[PDB]
């Protein structure tokens, strides 16, 4: 029971599964699409100090990954290189075949130390961390991601109508992922 949204010509309706409207025509698997949309488009604060408050560490919950085929250009990506004060890794290494988000103008690369009191870093609002055509619930080490969400669509019968430089900004952080976190931007 996941909302499948059907796009009629010049309209979008959330397909009601109990009712059956056959007037929509789905003649091939080419018409089924998944799309990733960035939270930026809803007006959420993108500043690094504000953004970092939405993530938090948690143990006991296994990570999960789901693929998506098409995405949106991001203005802001993030890249974490975090270590514990003794010197250890609190973010897991990227599994095979997880590359960074393809297109983002600014990459906020944050390095520093924190308590990292948990096995994995999750999103407190239930959104996903979007990578290159894979959305995962957790943050991986050294791999640029965007915050986003996934939707599923039935495209219209007509194919045709529907479906570069980057900069890096470096930050130092102490007490990362805490109530009060201290940043110095270079």
């Amino acid at each position, epitope marked *: 029971s996941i909302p499948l949204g059907v796009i009629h010509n010049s309209a979008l309706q959330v397909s009601d599964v109990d009712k059956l409207v056959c007037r929509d025509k789905l003649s091939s698997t080419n018409q089924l699409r998944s799309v990733g949309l960035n939270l930026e488009g809803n007006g959420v604060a993108t500043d690094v100090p504000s953004a970092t408050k939405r993530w938090g560490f948690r143990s006991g919950v296994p990570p999960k990954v789901v693929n998506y085929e098409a995405g949106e250009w991001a203005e802001n990506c993030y890249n974490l290189e975090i*270590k514990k*004060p*003794d*010197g*250890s890794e609190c973010l897991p290494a990227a599994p095979d075949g997880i590359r960074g988000f393809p297109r983002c103008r600014y990459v906020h690369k944050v*390095s520093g*130390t*924190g*308590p990292c*009191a948990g096995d994995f870093a999750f999103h407190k609002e239930g959104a996903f961390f979007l990578y290159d055509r894979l959305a995962s619930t957790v943050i991986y080490r050294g791999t640029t991601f965007a915050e986003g969400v996934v939707a599923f669509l039935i495209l219209p019968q007509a194919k045709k109508d529907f479906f570069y430089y980057s900069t890096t900004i470096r930050y*130092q952080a*102490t*007490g990362f992922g*805490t*109530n*009060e976190t*201290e940043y110095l931007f270079e």
Partner: antibody, heavy 122, light 110 residues
């Protein structure tokens, strides 16, 4: 894992000195280190921290001792050098170099202190 | 800017005693591990307790520990004569850019 510190001698206040911590038993390239000193009749105390060279983070110093002391390392010799300049009053204590190194299982990082040296001013 | 601890504790042989280390929001409150070291007079401190009751090597199961809120405790059951030592609690402060803070010191007596 073993550490040995040397350089312990009496110095007239106002001079300079070099304390050397030489270790063996672990990959010395990728470990953080801290210099900690213990005064007689008092609890332990912290003086400085040096980060790994690969990370490149700036070394940090305590609040009273920031400035005069200078920490560094040398990988080709596997050593950690602490240089103290213009020694004043009450800088009199044992010095230990502490590192955190895993056990090849990486599940945790034990602490491995050193024997330390004596440094007195007069 | 130092961790607190009781001046000294006492107890009969074979019973249990607990040593308290009370921190602040920046250290233990934030979520950092607590390290316990035992210094016998004349030598250097070694590690006794790390994190959640983890023993490095050759440590009697008599030593345990807990953490709650901004405080922590070390529990030792079955005090013997050789337990005379100074115990120090350590953590990482934040207002110090994530760096050592040490406890005062406790005289455990048997």
């Amino acid at each position: 894992v073993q550490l040995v510190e040397s350089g312990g001698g009496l110095v007239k206040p106002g001079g300079s000195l070099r304390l050397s911590c030489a270790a063996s038993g672990f990959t010395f390239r990728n470990a953080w280190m801290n210099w900690v000193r213990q005064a007689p009749g008092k609890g332990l105390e912290w003086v400085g921290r040096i980060k790994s060279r690969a990370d490149g983070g700036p070394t940090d110093y305590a609040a009273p001792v920031k400035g005069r002391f200078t920490i560094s390392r040398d990988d080709s010799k596997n050593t950690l050098y602490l240089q103290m300049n213009s020694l004043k009053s009450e800088d009199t204590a044992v010095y230990y170099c502490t590192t955190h190194v895993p056990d090849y299982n990486s599940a945790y990082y034990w602490v491995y202190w050193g024997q330390g040296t004596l440094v007195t001013v007069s | 800017s130092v961790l607190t601890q009781p001046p000294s504790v006492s107890g009969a042989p074979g019973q249990r005693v607990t040593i308290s280390c009370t921190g602040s929001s920046s250290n233990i409150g934030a979520g950092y591990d607590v390290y316990w070291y035992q210094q016998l007079p004349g030598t250097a401190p070694k590690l006794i307790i790390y994190g959640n009751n983890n023993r490095p090597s050759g440590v009697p199961d008599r030593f345990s520990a807990s953490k709650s809120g901004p405080s922590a405790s070390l529990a030792i059951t079955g005090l013997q004569a050789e337990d005379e030592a100074d115990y120090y609690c350590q953590s990482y402060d934040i207002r110090l850019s994530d760096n050592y803070v040490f406890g005062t010191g406790t005289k455990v007596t048997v």
